[PDB]
């Protein structure tokens, strides 16, 4: 049985002046070491206050797009094999009011080498409960090309390993992930 579901993030599409959004959940395939026995399928379980809970089988895929329209929408990604689904999983809640709640006070990024950037930050004395953080990075003034990594909330620094395009300035968006939902990021631009 898989011990833990995969860590996951998202990207959105749609008119930014409307609440409805096509949300694409994103994860990496669970490695041999990560699950012990082979993961055969992934399941996306949804929950909203007025539609209840429903699950979508996505097979061997590593993304799932759904239309988000409700005041709050929680998603959980489960890893499945013949013995069952992962009991403990990561969760993300989409809530537009939560997207206006900050937690990152200061943010720095140092290009230690052409393929390694150290991110450092401080957090504000919270009220909402921080689950963890997610760093997004992409080329400044570009549409896609986004990469992400989950960061434990117990650290104040994180090393990002990437085959960065050195001539392009990169934009680093550190997102706080609260129990109540994904929060307001802190963003800095910098060369690598």
């Amino acid at each position, epitope marked *: 049985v898989p011990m833990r579901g995969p860590e996951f993030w998202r*990207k959105m599409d749609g*008119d*930014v*002046t*409307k609440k409805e*959004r096509n949300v694409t959940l994103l994860w990496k395939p669970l490695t041999k070491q990560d699950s012990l026995s082979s993961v055969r399928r992934y399941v996306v379980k949804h929950r909203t206050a007025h539609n209840g809970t429903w699950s979508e089988d996505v097979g061997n895929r590593t993304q799932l797009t759904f239309l988000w329209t409700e005041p709050a929408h929680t998603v959980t990604v489960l890893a499945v094999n013949s013995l069952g689904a992962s009991l403990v999983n990561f969760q993300l809640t989409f809530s*537009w009011p939560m997207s206006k709640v900050s937690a990152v006070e200061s943010l720095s990024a140092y290009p230690l080498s052409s393929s390694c950037v150290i991110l450092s930050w401080t957090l504000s004395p919270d009220d909402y409960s921080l689950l963890y953080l997610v760093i997004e990075w992409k080329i*400044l003034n570009e549409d896609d090309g986004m990469k992400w990594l989950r960061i434990p909330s117990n650290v104040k620094k994180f090393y990002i390993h990437d085959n960065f395009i050195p001539i392009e300035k990169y934009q680093f968006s550190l997102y706080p992930v609260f129990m109540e939902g994904v929060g307001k990021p802190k*963003i800095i631009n910098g060369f690598t």
Partner: nanobody
Amino acid sequence: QVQLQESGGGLVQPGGSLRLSCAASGFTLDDYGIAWFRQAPGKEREGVSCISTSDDSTYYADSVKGRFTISRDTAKNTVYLQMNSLKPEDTAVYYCAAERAPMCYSRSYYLVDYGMDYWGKGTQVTVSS
């Protein structure tokens, strides 16, 4: 004292153009992003256009894309909204509003009235024959 002030509104015939200005004071474009909203008769204040606080990325309401263009002059602490090929349904009071950075940063952001920290008094735009 934080202040946002719109100007440039007026009466235009359908097909015409107007350019709105929003002068800000008491804060800079470094700490807040300034975006445009509009409130048509009997409706709520809806997002029209924004520009990122991190880069020059811009986003628009579906009904105004291509016709409208937001721009800024950071040295003057002023934002603009160029409004072309105006339609009667564009009639509304237009507001500029500030939101603590970062804002308008990607498609994971929502330009919504409740997220704004400061508002201008608004400028009437009337598109009529």
